[PDB]
């Protein structure tokens, strides 16, 4: 009878989405097969009938290398085969990731790139493989690529890093594409740049991998990012693992999951703007948009009186004060709908808008629909 | 302008689906005002200006008692007023929760109610609270509910745990409602009930209060949960801390957050059917029928033969077996769109449809809609 219980345990964590995506994806292959699997989640650190784990962490790859029950390890690829642990390694393709955002920058505009990696002193080792991934693709362009090695995930001198890494930020040429190992590290940037008042994406561009939806939610700037194939990755692991239970003999398998898409956000909203009095001029429009902005400020904000400020912006991106105080005040509203569970009349208030109609009326004038039509529409 | 950027620190656990539900809820308020805050997610073992923390944890209190920076605790509700901690508290209203599930069962048909909850041990206070709530929700019913304190999620001797909840589980009358304090220990019910070959929701009906997105998939029996209000929790979590970074004149704050909706899945998709032969009949019809089995693989698991089992089928639904095989297997397929990261070509093959045209066919025989008109208009 259909009840061959296969008590399988999964070794991951819910901290990073990259993990929360993999296990959920196992639950994906679980429907397609309706197998009678007894799936457990026990791990800090008996075992069970079968396993699945995050082998990027050597800690679990070296201890479990004694049992032989069906184990399918997940993690990050290695262009260098011999750098692979003992077990069928179904992983994501580091290089496919880095190069994934890279093109994204070049697709929008960018011609100067820098990589914000990570100290070889952090347990993690994919950091590194994302560094060679970067190198190989940059050496084809014109402008070389600068690389930085931040601090511990969260060092003692929490504050020191905040200033040590910053120096680097000013050391790069303007309009750069700063790629970060993870959305975790690219955070450091979006926050320091917010401190050193370093317009983004105007002066520099930020971009990460993990795209984890928890962090990127909270900050002034939305962190544009790549989208690993984590779901698909943890879905493959369960299918291949099922093929290890029917006992297939197999040469250590190593398939590579291709990153999905690349969700685009503010952190990269580049528009090849090259005019100084227009640069800050813009970043400004953005920050204070839904705060109801006038001229006087706009002027000394880029640091240019009325005339000397007018004579300028008027030439480069074509869009009156009103033309841009609107779109950046609409975006701020479009964002507070699709990816931000809230209200519809509360958003018209904290976004500078008189009545509902005065909010709805101006919407259709741009999009052929309305708020309620859009709210659930492209929501996430 | 405003350059006063506070260094606000959020104290939560990125692992459980709850804390995260809140942390993002904060990043929700960071968006309504574009406040000058540097939110810092931390909580591993110096702080900052404003702080938020999971006060459901006792260690967190003795860890913060006596620091003066404004703290806003976030956690579960408490029946006893004196219960709540010395600091302000935006909390989830446990009562509202248990009660929301309650109604769902007080409506789906179930008259006899149960309750699987944590022991005393798990310092999880809210638990003792969600329990006490149950006690009050049942008293004025017909059949006294049940109060079973499990043991541990990851106990000392996991095996033995099986034993004991299998025991109590087998003590419950057919058609009981199991409201599990959490979507975490709620599964423990559905994975044991998978081993006792116990019908769900044919015999007993399960229901959790977390709406954990991780486990959702994992157990074939789509668990039905009480989607909380942890989002609206994180938004006032910040609205209060903001108002707090203004030395306002306010007494110790104690505001509860009721849950939004309750997602319905198999676990509670119970239908009044007391005819033993058709009870277990649908156990395969609703479990593995989506696979594609003979119209006889269905009359034996039940309790009888072919002519002697389908006999009282007209009693149940009104039709026979073949008059539900083309209005059920679809449902085991149509769901692979709503709560699964999958496609539609995949499912049409699984249930077996020469094309999407046929999948289109029996799609209008109950909902005049279409696969693509129901894939978007209803997804999520």
Curated annotation (Swiss-Prot), chains A, B:
| Domain HTH araC/xylS-type, first and last residues per copy | 279-377
Which residue ranges does the Swiss-Prot or TrEMBL entry mark as DNA-binding?
A: 296-317, 344-367
Q: Which UniProt keywords apply?
A: DNA-binding, Transcription, Transcription regulation
The protein's matches in Pfam families, at most eight in alphabetical order, are given as: HTH_18, PBP1_XylR, Peripla_BP_3
Give the GO terms filed under biological process for this record: regulation of DNA-templated transcription
Q: Which cysteines are joined by disulfide bonds?
A: none
Question: GO molecular-function annotation terms?
Answer: DNA-binding transcription factor activity; transcription cis-regulatory region binding
Q: What does this protein do?
A: Regulatory protein for the xylBAFGHR operon.
- Name the UniProt record assigns to this protein: Xylose operon regulatory protein
Recall the taxonomic lineage recorded for the source organism: Bacteria, Pseudomonadati, Pseudomonadota, Gammaproteobacteria, Enterobacterales
């Amino acid at each position: 009878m259909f009840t061959k219980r296969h008590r399988i345990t999964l070794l991951f964590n819910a901290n990073k989405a990259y993990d929360r995506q993999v296990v959920e994806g196992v639950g994906e292959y679980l429907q397609a097969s309706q197998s009678e699997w007894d799936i457990f989640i026990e791990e800090f650190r008996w075992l069970g009938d079968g396993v699945i784990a995050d082998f990027d962490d050597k800690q679990i790859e070296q201890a479990l290398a004694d049992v032989d029950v069906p184990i399918v390890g997940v993690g990050g690829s290695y262009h260098l085969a011999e750098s692979y642990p003992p077990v069928h390694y179904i992983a994501t393709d580091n290089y496919a990731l880095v190069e994934s955002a890279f093109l994204h920058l070049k697709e929008k505009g960018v011609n100067r790139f820098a990589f914000y990696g990570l100290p070889e002193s952090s347990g993690k080792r994919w950091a590194t493989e994302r560094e060679y991934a970067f190198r190989q693709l940059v050496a084809e362009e014109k402008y070389r690529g600068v690389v930085y090695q931040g601090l511990e995930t969260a060092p003692e001198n929490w504050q020191h890093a905040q200033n040590r890494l910053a120096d680097w930020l000013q050391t790069l040429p303007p309009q750069t594409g700063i790629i970060a190992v993870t959305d975790a590290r690219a955070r450091h940037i979006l926050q320091v740049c917010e401190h050193l008042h370093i317009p983004v994406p105007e002066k520099l561009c930020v971009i990460g991998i993990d795209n984890e939806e928890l962090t990127r939610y909270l900050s002034r700037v939305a962190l544009s990012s790549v989208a690993q194939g984590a779901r698909q990755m943890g879905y493959q692991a369960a299918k291949l693992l099922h093929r290890l239970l029917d006992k297939e003999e197999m040469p250590l398998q190593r398939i590579l999951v291709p990153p999905v898409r690349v969700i685009e956000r503010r952190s990269t909203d580049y528009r090849s703007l090259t005019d100084p009095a227009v640069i800050q001029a813009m970043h400004y429009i953005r920050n204070h948009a839904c705060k109801g902005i006038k001229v006087d400020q706009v002027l000394d904000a880029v640091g240019i009186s009325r005339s000397n400020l007018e004579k300028r912006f008027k030439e480069e991106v074509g869009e009156t004060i009103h033309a841009m105080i609107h779109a950046e005040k609409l975006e701020k509203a479009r964002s507070l709908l699709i990816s931000t569970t809230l209200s519809i009349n509360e958003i018209s208030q904290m976004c500078g808008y008189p009545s509902l109609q005065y909010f709805y009326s101006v919407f259709k004038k741009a999009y052929d629909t309305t708020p309620k039509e859009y709210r659930d529409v492209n929501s996430e």
